[PDB]
Amino acid sequence: VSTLIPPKVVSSKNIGSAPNAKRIANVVHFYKSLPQGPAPAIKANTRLARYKAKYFDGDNASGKPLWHFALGIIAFGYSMEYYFH
Amino acid sequence: LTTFSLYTIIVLLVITSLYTLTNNNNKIIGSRWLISQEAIYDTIMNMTKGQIGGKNWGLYFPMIFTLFMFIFIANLISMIPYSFALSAHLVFIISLSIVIWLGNTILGLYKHGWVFFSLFVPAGTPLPLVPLLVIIETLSYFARAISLGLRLGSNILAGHLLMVILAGLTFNFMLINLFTLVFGFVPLAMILAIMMLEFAIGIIQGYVWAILTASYLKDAVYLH
Secondary structure (H helix, E strand, O other), rough: OOOOOOOOOOOOOOOHHHHHHHHHHOOOOOOOOOOOOOOOOOOOOOOOOHHHHHHHOOOOOHHHHHHHHHHHHHHHHHHHHHHOO | OOOOOOOOHHHHHHHHHHHHEEEEEEEOOHHHHHHHHHHHHHHHHHHHHHHHOOOOHHOOOOOHHHHHHHHHHHHHHOOOOOOOOOOOOHHHHHHHHHHHHHHHHHHHHOOOOHHHHHHHHHOOOHHHHHHHHHHHHHHHHHHHHHHHHHHHHHHHHHHHHHHHHHHHOOOOOOOOOOOHHHHHHHHHHHHHHHHHHHHHHHHHHHHHHHHHHHHHHHHHHOOO
């Protein structure tokens, strides 16, 4: 008999139902987000970090470190091969 | 620290370097070695789903994964000219097979108890043939107890022995002979071939071990 008032009732529930769950999921991660490679930490030195940076990095990612390890184990084992036989 | 101890500590160091040292800062990009580890994880997890899946595959996936990586790192250090096959006794693989069979039997006797004896009679085979069936399946399980060790261990030792005998018998490759042409270089070709064969065999038999232990776990948990 009178005029009910829909057009300003969105205060109680934000428009949409499915994207409401994703709103909180995607709005919160943008605060603590790296602008462009912040704190890359590409430089380190712990007597083995240089080897990791030079060979164990994703830029090369080749089979050369495995061959170097094989050569090193051969060099180490030559001495005890002489010692045993 | 004996040869086996140093070999195992080096294996542990390199295997942990392949994961914790591959990550420069543990990015979400998932680099080529990271994506290789991801592919291996996905493959082992889908062994688990395909062969033991249905209620409790995820629970038993980790031992499949760990055994796969241990066998992978053992087989990787098998072709290096100095590489010794883990003190060259290979009884370790037999011990692993025996302990895995014992664990599977314990799991069967725990989750089924006396019902585990009903596994010897899958579908039919009535009373006149029941003792024969139970004897046959018990002997098959006893053979399974030794199948896994006398398999990977046997192939690794056979590959190493072939390596040694081949290298020994071509010692005159260009020492004093006059016929050391490509005909005399053919032995080098067969040595290269057995390099490739040993590599492929090691990888495919690691896969064999994974699928066999998955099937054994399925037979233990699920009675058919």
